[PDB]
Design an enzyme around this catalytic site. Structure first.
Site, PDB file in Angstrom:
ATOM      1  N   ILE A 291       0.835  -1.206   0.000  1.00  0.00           N
ATOM      2  CA  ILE A 291       0.000   0.000   0.000  1.00  0.00           C
ATOM      3  C   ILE A 291       0.877   1.266   0.000  1.00  0.00           C
ATOM      4  O   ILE A 291       0.538   2.258  -0.658  1.00  0.00           O
ATOM      5  CB  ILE A 291      -1.035   0.011   1.210  1.00  0.00           C
ATOM      6  CG1 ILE A 291      -1.990  -1.201   1.176  1.00  0.00           C
ATOM      7  CG2 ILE A 291      -1.943   1.204   1.151  1.00  0.00           C
ATOM      8  CD1 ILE A 291      -1.332  -2.596   1.303  1.00  0.00           C
TER       9      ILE A 291
ATOM     10  N   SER B 294      11.377   3.877   9.302  1.00  0.00           N
ATOM     11  CA  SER B 294      11.102   2.465   9.152  1.00  0.00           C
ATOM     12  C   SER B 294      12.399   1.722   9.347  1.00  0.00           C
ATOM     13  O   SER B 294      13.445   2.208   8.908  1.00  0.00           O
ATOM     14  CB  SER B 294      10.603   2.158   7.732  1.00  0.00           C
ATOM     15  OG  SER B 294      10.262   0.801   7.616  1.00  0.00           O
ATOM     16  N   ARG B 295      12.329   0.550   9.980  1.00  0.00           N
ATOM     17  CA  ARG B 295      13.436  -0.406   9.982  1.00  0.00           C
ATOM     18  C   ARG B 295      13.300  -1.355   8.751  1.00  0.00           C
ATOM     19  O   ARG B 295      14.049  -2.347   8.628  1.00  0.00           O
ATOM     20  CB  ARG B 295      13.426  -1.256  11.263  1.00  0.00           C
ATOM     21  CG  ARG B 295      13.334  -0.493  12.582  1.00  0.00           C
ATOM     22  CD  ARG B 295      13.578  -1.411  13.785  1.00  0.00           C
ATOM     23  NE  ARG B 295      14.982  -1.405  14.226  1.00  0.00           N
ATOM     24  CZ  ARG B 295      15.499  -0.544  15.114  1.00  0.00           C
ATOM     25  NH1 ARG B 295      14.727   0.390  15.670  1.00  0.00           N
ATOM     26  NH2 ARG B 295      16.791  -0.610  15.452  1.00  0.00           N
TER      27      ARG B 295
ATOM     28  N   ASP C  74     -11.905  -7.749   7.783  1.00  0.00           N
ATOM     29  CA  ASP C  74     -10.825  -6.994   7.190  1.00  0.00           C
ATOM     30  C   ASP C  74     -11.212  -6.423   5.811  1.00  0.00           C
ATOM     31  O   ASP C  74     -11.187  -5.196   5.619  1.00  0.00           O
ATOM     32  CB  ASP C  74      -9.549  -7.851   7.187  1.00  0.00           C
ATOM     33  CG  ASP C  74      -8.364  -7.145   6.544  1.00  0.00           C
ATOM     34  OD1 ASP C  74      -8.530  -6.497   5.486  1.00  0.00           O
ATOM     35  OD2 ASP C  74      -7.258  -7.244   7.116  1.00  0.00           O
TER      36      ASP C  74
ATOM     37  N   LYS D  85      -6.298   2.248   7.358  1.00  0.00           N
ATOM     38  CA  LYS D  85      -7.580   1.604   7.723  1.00  0.00           C
ATOM     39  C   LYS D  85      -7.263   0.215   8.285  1.00  0.00           C
ATOM     40  O   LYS D  85      -6.369  -0.431   7.807  1.00  0.00           O
ATOM     41  CB  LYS D  85      -8.537   1.530   6.479  1.00  0.00           C
ATOM     42  CG  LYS D  85      -9.393   0.215   6.305  1.00  0.00           C
ATOM     43  CD  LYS D  85      -8.656  -0.821   5.398  1.00  0.00           C
ATOM     44  CE  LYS D  85      -9.388  -2.172   5.253  1.00  0.00           C
ATOM     45  NZ  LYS D  85      -9.277  -2.999   6.518  1.00  0.00           N
TER      46      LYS D  85
END
Lengths: 309, 309
Positions: free
Chosen positions: A18, A40-41, A172, A94
């Site tokens: 995404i 971010s890692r 979901d 979301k």
């Protein structure tokens, strides 16, 4: 006369599909945002300042005005919290949190800081959605049937997360239909009865049958099914006296009676919405679709169907 | 100088044990209320005008200002809705609705009508509750353990409703501890993990193990158990650095360290609160404890233990 505006300096926290297919491309086109950093890692963005933690980034990049938080809901509270504590606007993926309580907490924090918080619901921005909404408003409504049936195997191959307790199972993809219905209907609805179909392992459902009512007793039937291997269905059909609307393809196409009356721009409109509420100085945290999910789990008759591999 | 005040004209809708043991007796003592009518197909009150339906009563008794709605949450939306549509203040029994969505709907209706809506939480008004709250505020908190273990057989003999999908199972007595914790703690908490223990029939749980956190990571452990045939436990223990509070007997008694520092007046304080918010022109609808219940059902690993007869 003309009013000039500088970009909102944006940071992205998180990685994944995404992030590459939707976030970055929409950000690249949107002139009200400047992408100034990532945290971010699990990856960086070429030519953009990178950091391994959100705290490292908030320290080193004081020009940041907003953050898009793209991780799953599990990890996401802590990061949203530090951002709002820093006074940054926050774009939540979301669903907006793992629980309703965390989200109501983040919302309170945001108001207290004057920072705009945003629960994104991509499907709500599918291209025939507002035309359905405006329609149903001029018209009298009889019943509403929601069909959201898809094949897991095709869309969620070998994934473990969806079946964890908390992963939501069929809810979901199902919350997306909920996020449309909630916007489309004239009056709020509530769950009146629900059946939840679990496999013997795992701790999350494969199908659901749900009935809702509004105050005037308008009936809403919703079926969510993750075994539809054949014809793919993402529709919301409304019997009206003007006289039957179909919204299909996850909010993409609208056929009034059969007179089937634009191309998919979900994430670009999300970013328009985010730019919009920041400049208005407001939040947009509609939890109604997640609220429906939680109600369904609280009211649902838990029915066992088989195993899944 | 002295300000004279006429009573708030009250109607009661519903019957049952809580109506006789709690509502009517508290109303009889409270001079800010005049009980002017009842509505029920299951009973009347001697010397009080009676009606079989809430609509019949609202038509025939225009002097009514407020209504206490004492039925279970199942039947209760429709009645609360007509009352608020009439512009009456509304006292809701616990929990305030079957779903969170219905309640958020009733709340919106109430604001729109200027009518005071009230989610009563009796346990929150147990006599050591405010002394716990004030304590915890002056102090630093380490951990929190909630023990709410009781014997079904003793308290809910042969009853069917508790096991329906929607009946809440052990969460029915459990929401009372939640309604205290939610009030007692300095910061809101949220569910981080949960296990829900169901019988093989019925569709509602017998026990639950639940962990929460706040933003500062304060741990909260809650165990709810409906098999505690021996020692009855309704406690909330907090390890503090000042240095250990115990609130027992459903909020009734408070022992700081062991220095055990009033008599039970829950429903009389509920009616004080109701009189209070009506005169202030406000609502008091804290859904936080029902929200925790719904989160627990949404996040909970559904574990099967045996059968129940």
């Amino acid at each position: 006369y003309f009013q000039s505006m500088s970009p909102i300096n944006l940071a992205i926290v998180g990685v994944g599909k995404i992030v590459r297919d939707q976030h970055l491309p929409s950000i690249a086109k949107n002139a009200n945002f400047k992408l100034v950093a990532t945290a971010s890692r699990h990856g960086t963005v070429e030519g953009v300042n990178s950091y391994t933690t959100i705290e490292a980034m908030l320290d080193a990049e004081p020009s940041i005005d907003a953050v898009s938080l793209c991780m799953p809901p599990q990890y996401r509270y802590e990061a949203a919290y530090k951002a709002l504590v820093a006074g940054k606007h926050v774009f939540l993926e979301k669903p907006p949190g793992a629980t309703l309580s965390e989200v109501a907490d983040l919302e309170a924090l945001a108001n207290k800081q004057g920072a705009s918080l945003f629960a994104s619901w991509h499907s709500r921005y599918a291209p025939a959605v507002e035309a359905a909404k405006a329609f149903l408003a001029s018209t009298t409504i009889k019943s509403v049937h929601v069909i959201w049936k898809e094949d897991v195997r095709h869309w969620h191959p070998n994934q473990d997360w969806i079946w964890q307790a908390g992963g939501l199972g069929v809810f979901d993809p199902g919350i997306n239909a909920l996020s449309i219905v909630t916007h489309i209907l004239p009056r709020p609805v509530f769950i009146t009865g629900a059946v939840l179909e679990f496999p013997e392992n795992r701790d999350a459902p494969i199908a659901a049958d749900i009935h809702f009512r509004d105050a005037d007793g308008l009936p809403v039937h919703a079926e969510f099914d993750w075994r539809q291997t054949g014809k793919q269905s993402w529709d919301i059909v409304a019997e009206t006296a003007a006289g039957q609307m179909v919204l299909s393809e996850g909010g993409a196409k609208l056929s009034i009676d059969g007179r089937l009356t634009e191309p998919e721009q979900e994430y670009p409109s999300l970013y328009r919405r985010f730019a919009e509420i920041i400049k208005a100085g407001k939040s947009d945290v509609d939890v109604a679709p997640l609220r429906h999910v939680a109600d369904a789990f609280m009211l649902g008759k838990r029915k066992f169907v088989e195993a899944f591999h």
